[PDB]
Amino acid sequence: FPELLRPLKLGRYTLRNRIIMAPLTRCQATEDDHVPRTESMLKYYEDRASAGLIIAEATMVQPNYTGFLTEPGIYSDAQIEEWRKIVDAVHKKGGLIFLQLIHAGRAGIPEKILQQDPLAGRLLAASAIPIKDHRIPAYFAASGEKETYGVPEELTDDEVRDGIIPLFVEGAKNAIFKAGFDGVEIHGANGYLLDAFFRESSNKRQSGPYAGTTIDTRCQLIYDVTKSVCDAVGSDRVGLRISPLNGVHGMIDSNPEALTKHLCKKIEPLSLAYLHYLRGDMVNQQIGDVVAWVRGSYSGVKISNLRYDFEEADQQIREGKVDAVAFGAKFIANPDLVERAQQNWPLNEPRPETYYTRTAVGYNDYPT
Template identity: 45%
Template sequence: MSLRNLFAPIKLGAHALKNRIIMAPLTRCRATPDDHIPTDIMIEYYADRADAGLIITECSMITPLTSAFYSEPGVYSEEQLTEWKKVTDAVHAKGGKIFCQIWHAGRAAHPAFNNGAENVSATAIAIDGPLRGGIRKLTHVIPRELTINEIGEIVQLFAKAASNCVNVAGFDGVEIHGANGYLIDQFLKDSSNKRTDNYGGSLMNRTRFLFEVLSAVTNAIGSDRVGVRFSPISGVNSQSDSDPEALATYIATEINTFNLGYVHVIRNDSLGVLTDNYLPVYRKYYNGILIGNGKYTKEEADEAISNGNIDAVAFGTPFVANPDLVTRFEINSTLNKPDPSTFFVQGVKGYNDYPKLNFSAL
């Protein structure tokens, strides 16, 4: 029997993890609106999940006026970083590791959440349909196409955000959000990138922004403290690509030059429309630590790790309702069921009130 399973330790970049149960990034909208400062209830929420091998936080804004969820946190102001430091200290006090997922929403941002500021993207094409998560029912608007100079400025914003996270807020590293139809993914996919300059057209051009961000961030904090997340077939935010296998192959091959801590791949289409799985493409061409995500059961995750198909598994929704998920997995306990109506609202309901195991009653 293989000794590799969810509970086996693993070296991930600069860090030794106690298990391979990763907490996936989960937008929860518990920061303050407008100034996007983490709140006290977030300290308890993350600290309660410190038994995970690694916690990856919800997406956090790298610059003002780019909100897509109204009350997601940021990592660009002193006030935000001060409050995040309370979170990382609490997680570390319990022996946990925590990375911050940093992002730019691009065309998924909405002027209504950003004092009327326009949203931007690779190309001036709007997302089809309503916003995800935000408290108001709004339809997406047409973004403005970024200039070459603006792209370079955003690259540097990613680097500054990464430095803020590690050197000020005390995070163990960062995950760059390259998935689910946000700005980096908007450059990667040809449904949202119709540019005719050096950032559009060929695979080399469409991945140029991603690799420039990776270069800047790894130079800022070290490659072994950096991960990146991709969603090869996710239809979220109107995303699609004419040849997802070619795109996955190119990224998985070229990204080896960065010697990252890990690559994190969402294997499924969360909308349930597409059924292909390009996680094996990353396993074939990417030489580093590969984290899989997408509705894994504990048993399937164990098997995938044992077979070498992936190195660790990120669990999302199960961590929402089960702060003690690692313990529940260890003793094969039943899991609490999450309440989707509380995913993107303020307050402790559906956040810090899920019951933990009572061992005195077992």
């Protein structure tokens, strides 16, 4: 896999290879303080530092606005302190690491958020449309009871512009200037806040710069947040992730192609370190050639993801369709994935049953 193992210029950095570790929520942080549990999390990331680039798991930018109960945050000094240790360990191995910045939006856990600053103690989204497809996963629920997502409040353009955006900015500054991350990745995918403004199913705003009436206005929040973050920490230290076809939380847009292409053209002027996207849906309902769409509408670094294997990854990079591929499940199960690629070693099979144990089990128990 010569193309997959070839170095790559990304932002102000140079990846040793194009085997990227996708952001992976593992819930290895303290419950209410959302402080990275360094003991386990450090070894986890250090063990995978041979990755061309590691994209750290979705990390909270709004205090207490938790979507996964015990995910990391990057808004407090306590969180910054531990992250720094983790980032330092990755860098000592010669690796690179970006931190994915997230806001759960309507996917926030009610029992935790509502039990709490005009943005505090509230569920926020583009529109008062609750997730209805499924319950809150038991490994994310605040109690043993069957919990369900709530009806969020419609964010005013003012709260968005002056409340939400500044949080992403401080979070990026904290991550890069304090924790020492090489960069950050704006989480504009998988049904969370930004994706909720992005796709039509969850954005029914009648007016404002973030209206759900046009593809351009729906792309505005992703752009504004990304632009503001770029001005604050430099665009060559900023990446963005999207998932135009991911149906999670009932997310759906009728024009995934035009939406994706339009967003590419819109962020093009930002000169981002990269654009990262899921090329499909977890199930075979929503389909489309996202690789093709981004390819013909974006001139920057393209990082694709979803059900890739070394060969397919190597082949698309060879054909110039993508510049790099981020692996999710394979990195969970293979700390030394890169090495296994260099020699075509077989890969450990992942075990979804233990993705969120919060213990060493299914976290640091995968052999090298």
